[PDB]
């Protein structure tokens, strides 16, 4: 079964949070499940948030798996600095528009592909 966990995290209604990637643009936090999530889902969503980002979230909506990663959304109800020296170094996490998150997570492939699906899914009407 998948083996990592992803989110996307909003800030308000209208703007996700994205961190820094490794090629000087955004990304969605998502990472590998840790023993402490204890296999839970939920869990390990909640986790990478956090540590990524320092991100505390609410009540979070699974939306699907891609790219062999689950995928859910919650919107941030609290924000701090990573404690993480690792994380820190990359830099500020910031948010932006739907649509500019959109274009940060388009063309890049396997890295971003998953994330784009999952934002997709997480801004998709009815």
Same mark, same amino acid.
């Given at each position: !079964?998948?083996?990592?966990? #992803?989110? +996307?995290?909003?800030? $308000? =209604? ?38 990524? !980002?320092?991100?505390?979230? #609410?009540? +979070?909506?699974?939306? $699907? =798996? ?61």
């Amino acid at each position: !079964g998948p083996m990592r966990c #992803g989110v +996307v995290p909003f800030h $308000g =209604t209208s703007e996700v949070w994205m961190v820094p990637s490794k090629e000087s643009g955004w990304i969605l936090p998502k990472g590998g499940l840790d023993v402490q999530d204890g296999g839970d889902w939920e869990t390990c969503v909640r986790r990478e948030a956090r540590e990524e !980002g320092g991100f505390t979230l #609410g009540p +979070v909506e699974y939306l $699907g =798996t891609f790219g062999d990663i689950v995928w859910y959304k919650g919107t941030v109800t609290h924000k701090s600095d990573p404690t993480d020296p690792e994380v820190k170094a990359r830099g500020p996490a910031k948010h932006f528009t739907i649509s500019d998150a959109r274009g940060y997570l388009t063309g890049y492939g396997k890295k971003k592909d998953a994330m784009l699906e999952a934002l997709n899914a997480a801004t998709r009407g009815s």
